[PDB]
Structures are given as C-alpha cells and as structure tokens.
Amino acid sequence: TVLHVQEIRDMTPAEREAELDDLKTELLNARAVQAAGGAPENPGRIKELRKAIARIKTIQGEEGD
Amino acid sequence: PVYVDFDVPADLEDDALEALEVARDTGAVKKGTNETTKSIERGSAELVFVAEDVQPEEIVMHIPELADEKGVPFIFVEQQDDLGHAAGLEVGSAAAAVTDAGEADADVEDIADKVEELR
Amino acid sequence: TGAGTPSQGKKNTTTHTKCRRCGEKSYHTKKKVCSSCGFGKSAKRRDYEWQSKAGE
Amino acid sequence: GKKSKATKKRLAKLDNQNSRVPAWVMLKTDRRNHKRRHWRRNDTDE
Amino acid sequence: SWDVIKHPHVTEKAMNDMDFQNKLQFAVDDRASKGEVADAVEEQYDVTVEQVNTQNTMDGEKKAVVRLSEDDDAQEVASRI
Amino acid sequence: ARSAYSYIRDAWENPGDGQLAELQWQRQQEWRNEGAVERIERPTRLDKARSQGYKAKQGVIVARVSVRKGSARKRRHKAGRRSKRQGVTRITRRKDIQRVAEERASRTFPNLRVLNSYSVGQDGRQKWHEVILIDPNHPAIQNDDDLSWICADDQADRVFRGLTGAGRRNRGLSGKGKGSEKTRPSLRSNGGKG
RNA sequence: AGCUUUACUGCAGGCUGUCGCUGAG
RNA sequence: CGCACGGAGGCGAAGAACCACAGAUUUCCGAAUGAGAAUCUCUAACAAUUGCUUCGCGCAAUGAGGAACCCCGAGAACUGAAACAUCUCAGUAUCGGGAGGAACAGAAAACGCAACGUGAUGUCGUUAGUAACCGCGAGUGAACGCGAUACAGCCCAAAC
Ligand SMILES: [Cl-]
Ligand SMILES: [Cl-]
Ligand SMILES: [K+]
Ligand SMILES: [Mg+2]
Ligand SMILES: [Mg+2]
Ligand SMILES: [Mg+2]
Ligand SMILES: [Mg+2]
Ligand SMILES: [Mg+2]
Ligand SMILES: [Mg+2]
Ligand SMILES: [Mg+2]
Ligand SMILES: [Mg+2]
Ligand SMILES: [Mg+2]
Ligand SMILES: [Mg+2]
Ligand code: NA
Ligand code: NA
Ligand code: NA
Ligand code: NA
Ligand code: NA
Ligand code: NA
Ligand code: NA
Ligand code: NA
Ligand code: NA
Ligand code: NA
Ligand code: NA
C-alpha cells in the first residue's frame, strides 16, 4: 500500500537496504508496543510492515541486490 | 614365466629391441598379439618378440609352441612398454613380430642364431 | 509380592520416546531404535504387509 | 528428571495447546477444544 | 535469516530490574548467545552492555536479562519505545 | 587364420590340462588370499570377455568374485513342518552361484551395471567368476553405439531383476518352445511354477 | 496341546566308505 | 482480509480478491551424507561404496519414497483328503532385493494340425477340464493350432 513495487524498483540497492533497516525498526517498535499491551495500535500496518519487507527482499533478489 | 623356458641376457635383449626399431623404419613390423599370431601362421614372420610381464599369461602362452611348429624364431623381452615403444607405439605391447626386417636382416639373423644357441 | 498392582509401583523408567524421524513416541531411548519406523535400525522406513488384510 | 532443550520446547507447546478457544471465535462462527489435557488425568508423550 | 532481538519482555518483574537494577529484559531468538544478545542490544539502542543473563522459557522463547552500564539509564531507554 | 583369441578360448576348454593347468594351480593361491570382490585391470579370459561385450575402454570394469561351493546354507525349521518340508541338507537354491557372484559384484559397485560374467575356475570349496560391469554415466559409454543401451533408466539394477544373461538362462528362458510354458514371459506371471 | 517310548514316518547331529580340492617316487 | 458470520483495524480504480502458468523465499529432524544427538549440539565436510580422473571429492553415480501394478530371490500352516505321511491348501500368506510409468518377454539350435505347411513377443477368446500328473485316492492340469489385439525389426564376438 503506502509502499509500491515500482517505488522499490526505482530505489538503488543502497536505498532498499536503508529502507529495509527502516521498516525492520518500525516493525520492532510496533512489536515492542504490543509487548506492552499498547493499544495505540493500527493492526493493519504491522501486517503491512511484514509484506513490505518481503517485497523489498524479493526485489533485491530479482535485481541481484 | 610359464611360457618362458629360457632367460635372455640383458645385453641380448638390448640388441634385439634395437633391431626392432630399425625394423619399423627400414622394413615392416606387426604390433599386438593378434597381428603377431597371424604372421606366424601365415608364415610372413621372421622374428617375433614376446614380453615376460604379461598378465593374464593366456594372452601369449601359445606363441612359443606355435612359432616352433613354423620354424619362426622368437625372443623374450622383460618389459612390456619397452617392446611397445620399440615397435613405435605410445602404449605397451605384449608381442610384436618383424615381418621382413630391413638393414637389420644381418642382425636379426644373428639374434635368431644367438637364441637357438641359448637353447 | 503380587505381579499386579504391587509390581506396578517400580515403573518409573523411560524407554519409548518421541522419535526424531517419525514423530511417534516409539523411540526406545535405551536401544536407540524406533519400534514404529525403524529409525536407528533401518535406513528404509519400517513397514510390513501384515499391517493390513492380505488382499488389501 | 532432567529435560533437554528440545523436550522443553515440546512441553512448552503442549502447555500452549492446552488453552481454550478464544471467546471471539465463538461469535465469529455463531458457535470446544477436543485436545484439553490435564497434567494428572492425562499423559503426554516421551 | 533470523534476527537476534524479538521484542521487549515487559512485565512487573521486568520493570523492577529496570527501575532498580538498570536492566532490560528481552525475548530473544533461542539460538542467540549472551555475546550476540549483548552486541545486538548495544547496536539497536546505542548503550553499553555490562552483563547478560539468559533463560530458555516455558513459553518456547529465550529470555535475556541485560544490565546496562552506569552511563546509560534503562528506564529512559525503554521509554523511547 | 585363427585369431590369437581362439587360443585363449581353446585353452580354457580344458582348464585342468596344459599350461593353463599350472597357471591355475598358481593363481588360485593368490586368489584364495584376495577378497570377496577384486577389481582387476585385465580379463583373465580375453576371448570370453570380448565375446560377451567387453571392450578396452573407459567405463568398462571387471572384477573377480568368489562364492562358496555347494547347496543352500539352510537353517532347520523351528516350528511345525510336515516331513516334506523338514529338509535342510539336500535343499539347493534356485539361483546359481554365477548369479550370486554377479550380484555381490554389482553391490560392490553401486553405480555400475552388470553386463555379463564368466567362470574362471574353482578349487575344492569355492568358485570364481569374473564379472564385467559398465559405468552408465561415463560419456565414453553414453556415446558407444554398442553399449549405450545399458544407459537407459530401465536397465537400472538389471542384475537384481535377473535381466542378465546368466539370469535369463537360470530363469529357464533359453528354449522358445516346448518346456517354457511356465517360464516366458516371466516366472512370476506364471504363478512361480517354472 | 504338553510329555514319553524298542508306535508310524521323517529331520538334525555323530561315526564310517567314496568322489572333488589332490601333487611327485 | 481461508474454514470462521466477533471486536478493532486495514487493503483495493497505482485494478485488490480470486484462478492459471512461471519465479522468489523455503527454519529443524528426516535417505540424512563432517561428527554426535529422542527434532538438539560440537569443530569445514558428497559420510559410506564406486566410476572417471588434472589422483584434488576436481567431475559424476548410488542411498530413500510411492496406491497398487511389475521383476528377481526365501517360503509356511490352519485346511482338503471326512484320520493321515505323498498329495492338497500353494509357490498362496509372510519375508529379502530391485525397475518403470508401465514392467517382463521378444526376432527360433521355434513349431511338428508331418506339411509342396506356420513364421519374433506379450495379451484376449478358444483349444479344454482335453493331453499329462496322482496313497491312479481326493484332487491337480498345460501346449501346438485357431479367431482376435497390436505389429518391427536389429546390434556385436570372429574372419579380413
Ligand atoms: Cl546391475
Ligand atoms: Cl502350423
Ligand atoms: K499339511
Ligand atoms: Mg506374569
Ligand atoms: Mg498457562
Ligand atoms: Mg542457565
Ligand atoms: Mg495330541
Ligand atoms: Mg547428520
Ligand atoms: Mg483331513
Ligand atoms: Mg507379464
Ligand atoms: Mg482316502
Ligand atoms: Mg499345482
Ligand atoms: Mg506344443
Ligand atoms: Na500426567
Ligand atoms: Na514472545
Ligand atoms: Na550396481
Ligand atoms: Na518347474
Ligand atoms: Na498341553
Ligand atoms: Na515452498
Ligand atoms: Na553425492
Ligand atoms: Na577425488
Ligand atoms: Na476331515
Ligand atoms: Na486329526
Ligand atoms: Na500323490
């Protein structure tokens, strides 16, 4: 959603890796907030964060990084 | 070993192989037991060579007695790759025959005689 | 001593355990052989024709 | 008894499986865990 | 590839270690050693790890009790998340 | 004229006479000290090997195998049996020693396939057979118009399914007419009565 | 069905001759 | 936004859902193959057996599975004979080894309606419960040929 396939492909190898580490961190902080039973959640995004990472990783494979 | 009834002196074997080398370049030779065997049978054999390091021995056992009942002279060689090399092959050879020497007819002749004498 | 109830009290030995290969609780930890799939005895999986009716 | 790391994971899972069907699943399906195991009354593997 | 840190283990007991001993507790991957748990933590939060204690929980996950140096303050670190 | 080979052949018609006799009395001494399966660089009976498909080429292997002589090594019954089935001493196996030899060889060389085998004598308590095996995976053979046939998948483990020459003979498939009612096309399809 | 024996019939096993391995005077 | 009809939230006209083909990812144990181990652990690995070989695991092979079918080996007993031993149950059950999408067989040292004839092999129908076997008891039991199906014929060893 907020992140599309093209946008990922228009990135440079170093831009994807950077975007990856970004997503991972957001994900980790979403999980942390969930660990604390934090309700300011948005269940739809924690689900998205995982798909995004999958997409970025998938493209890195396709693009040879 | 089983088909060998006499030991050929190193020196004699040296001369023999020598004649063989000139035999191929001056006259004609047959390489390989099958070809050798046919020479002895067809009579076109003058001097035949047999290696002493053949395994299985059946491959050559028949040469001695065959040559006798054909008057064709024969001599033994220790190595197998030495006879093969002398005949001009990259590989070894269990037996070879000088089908009409060449500028060696003199030598071959004496070698044939030297062996008869060697009993 | 009765072979019944009174002899049931000493049974605190572990033999058959979850099998690393087939997942059944048949791995004899003392024999190191699975009574179900043959793990530890056979590379091939344990199987017999008598495990079903002859014509089936 | 001395449990290994693998045995511990399995026991752990069995404990988790030993929970109830969440209340919302009842509603979500307009309306039972057949795998409820008691430590005393039942017997796990291994 | 598996990540080392899974998430913060927040429970009353976890708090006490945080407020009273400058310790943070994490649910980490069970294939991670104390040393790996140490690094990962320092990298993800920019702090200095003094000691790490682990436990393989009856939940199937591995718990780590990490003590920070006097320089860092567990409470403040845990707050930003 | 006679081939040199014909002499090897003619000598083996009477392994108990002539030079061959002395040869055997000697070899078997070394043989009795070798193992169950011995790979050998050259066929002891060249004529026979070549006659059976042998070839001085890459991927063609030969190994001598020794098997014990005699009837079946059988265990006496440990439960009720009618007199008919109480035998031990006179029972013989339905597979001949040469076939046992071909199998032991093929198991020694898991990647190879049995092409054929031939006898090379026996002493008082054992028989020796030389088995010719082929590497179905070597390109030297995959490209040989005379042997590439053994490369097909359906030739896998041919010796264990009795597709060998000694196999088919032992299966009573020699005759194409009278006497082979229970053998062709297979022992099993004929109810195992062959 | 277990058991017995100079019940009937067989089967292991032991002993013994013979052939092969096995050759020289 | 599976079964799964809740709560919250989200995705889709940047064409999602869903379907087809192709690709990515694909933890640990497992033939399980670096070594050990009840799915974990210890310090670079085709373990083991082979073929080729630059003789170095460099290039390859094997292993295990599968509903039954198929091929090669090992091979009962209850039962029937109104007892029972040969016979029968039966080359059945069961066991060992192994192939393939089918196996196996197969181009005559055949047949032998004996012929001035047929012409690789399976299989189906028949020949026939015939011939043959058998305490000649109970029982057991083909083939050639014929009508069909489908058809296809070749390569070495040796001589030179
Ligand atoms: Cl094979
Ligand atoms: Cl006819
Ligand atoms: K019976
Ligand atoms: Mg009792
Ligand atoms: Mg609980
Ligand atoms: Mg500890
Ligand atoms: Mg009785
Ligand atoms: Mg392993
Ligand atoms: Mg009866
Ligand atoms: Mg068939
Ligand atoms: Mg009667
Ligand atoms: Mg019958
Ligand atoms: Mg007939
Ligand atoms: Na219990
Ligand atoms: Na957790
Ligand atoms: Na093999
Ligand atoms: Na028969
Ligand atoms: Na009784
Ligand atoms: Na997958
Ligand atoms: Na391999
Ligand atoms: Na190597
Ligand atoms: Na009766
Ligand atoms: Na009776
Ligand atoms: Na009878």
Side-chain angles (χ1 to χ4, degrees), chain E residues 41-56:
Chain E
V41 177
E42 305 195 309
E43 299 175 51
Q44 274 300 67
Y45 304 78
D46 194 323
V47 297
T48 294
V49 174
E50 284 308 307
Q51 177 181 290
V52 175
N53 287 210
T54 64
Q55 172 193 347
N56 279 303

Side-chain angles (χ1 to χ4, degrees), chain F residues 24-38:
Chain F
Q24 291 296 283
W25 181 83
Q26 283 167 35
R27 294 168 175 169
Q28 287 183 12
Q29 293 185 48
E30 287 158 53
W31 289 3
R32 291 160 201 149
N33 296 309
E34 312 203 322
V37 184
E38 294 296 328

Side-chain angles (χ1 to χ4, degrees), chain E residues 58-75:
Chain E
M58 279 306 302
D59 284 6
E61 307 187 69
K62 172 178 288 182
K63 181 167 69 181
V65 181
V66 191
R67 195 176 77 252
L68 306 180
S69 61
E70 281 173 42
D71 284 272
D72 315 303
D73 174 286
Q75 295 164 286

Side-chain angles (χ1 to χ4, degrees), chain C residues 17-21 27 29 32 43-45 48-49:
Chain C
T17 58
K18 185 87 160 178
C19 179
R20 203 207 306 168
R21 180 209 251 175
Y27 190 62
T29 200
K32 299 309 178 195
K44 296 174 185 60
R45 283 290 193 116
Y48 298 98
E49 290 304 328

